From a paper:
LCs were distributed in two groups: a set of eight amyloidogenic LCs responsible for severe cardiac involvement and symptoms in patients (hereafter, H LC), and a set of five non amyloidogenic LCs isolated from patients affected by multiple myeloma for which no amyloid aggregation or proteotoxicity was observed in patients (hereafter, M LC). VL and CL domains display very different structural properties in the seven crystal structures. CL domains (res 115–214) are typically characterized by high quality electron density, are all very well superposable, and the dimeric CL–CL arrangement is clearly conserved in all the analysed structures (root mean square deviations -r.m.s.d.- generally fall below 1.0 Å over the entire CL–CL dimer - Table S3A and Fig. 4B-bottom).
However, low Tmapp values do not correlate perfectly with LCs amyloidogenicity, since M7 and M10 LCs unfold at temperatures close to those of the most stable H LCs. Inspection of the SDS-PAGE gels shows that the proteolysis pattern is different in different H LCs, suggesting that the sequence of proteolytic events, and not only their kinetics, may be characteristic of each H LC. In H6 and M8 dimers all six CDRs (three for each LC monomer) are traceable in the electron density; in H9 and H10 five out of six are traceable, in H7 three, and in H3 and M7 only two CRDs are traceable. In some cases (H6, H9, H10) CDR3 (residues 89–97) participates in the interface; both CDR3s in the H7 dimer lack electron density, while in M7 and M8 CDR3 residues are located far from the VL–VL interface.
Author numbering:
A (entry chain A): 10 to 30, 34 to 45, 48 to 60, 70 to 87, 99 to 211
B (entry chain B): 3 to 211
Write the structure that this text describes.
């Protein structure tokens, strides 16, 4: 969930007990403070939460308990990820190893979801994905990798890496030889 | 309205006690949350005595007066996180939270990084691109220095390296990539990725085929 500076956002909470009947948590900080119509005090003033005037400091997790909503305050333009799926190299295959690397770069905001496929079959066994971190251009980079045996690599028609980034999905597919 | 030290350390397999202090703790039992970077908080203990399903038996909680404590016996590598206490706050149906305590688990087994260097893929060369990727995995502690080479010449421009993050095995992973044009890739005899991890340096080399 992202918003531009000075723009309007809506964070939504879904589940039971909402038919019958606010905490802000910045990274490595305590979730600080009621129910739809209430007047709090201590932090600057103005189920779903709406923020009319958004500042870079407002970038935090909001909780109604909900799973958590990472509100991103756009400090720069949105950028879809550049996705490159690298197949196992000849050198790695000659060493009886196979690793596929899905390189994800130049994206903003810094949140992605990665899914893998063996042919048309979704796979998650042997998958590791790194936490996005800032490049020198202030955009983000991450990598997801899938460890396979060379027999698994050669016995499949293809392998795919799918990257989801705020309503955009980029899938890259590679095939042996 | 609850106080706890910002950080604490323990040795692997040893016991750690994280304490919270506040007037509300004399009236209410504390709940404990575990939070790792880029992850949703996990309820580790509910109102001192309830351990939810999925939470290891290593976690327990106790209290005395205006203090509440979370005890981790036989602290594991997966237990490194920020631990926050929470409770109700006297006259008023609202919750108060502690500032959080970051836990460091010392004496964890060290590991040299596994380094895999990929040449440009056939799809990116067909698209007039020649980015190389250097996968750095299964290392501990989570700090590396990455340097690239064009034959024997060090490369500064076009290099990006990710901050190491934990894998599901509690070892770290990172990647470094070098953006090149097919021209730069084909003109050199080889390119290298050298990774420095404490007393170890691992370098891999790829060549155009």
């Amino acid at each position: 969930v992202s918003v531009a500076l000075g723009q309007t956002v809506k964070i939504t909470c879904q589940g039971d007990s909402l038919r019958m009947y606010w905490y802000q948590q910045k990274p490595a900080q305590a979730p600080v403070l009621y129910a739809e119509k209430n007047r709090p005090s201590g932090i600057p003033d103005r189920a779903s939460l709406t923020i009319t005037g958004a500042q870079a400091e407002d970038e935090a997790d909001y909780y109604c308990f909900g799973g958590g909503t990472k509100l991103t305050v756009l400090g720069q333009p949105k950028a879809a990820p550049s996705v490159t799926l690298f197949p196992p190299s000849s050198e790695e295959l000659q060493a009886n190893k196979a690793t596929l690397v899905c390189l994800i770069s130049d994206f903003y905001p810094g949140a992605v979801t990665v899914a893998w496929k063996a042919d048309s079959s979704p796979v998650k066994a042997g998958v590791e994905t790194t936490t996005p971190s800032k490049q020198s251009n202030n955009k983000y980079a991450a990598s997801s990798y899938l460890s396979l045996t060379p027999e698994q690599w050669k016995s499949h028609r293809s392998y795919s890496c799918q990257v989801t980034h705020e309503g955009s999905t980029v899938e890259k597919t590679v095939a042996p030889t």
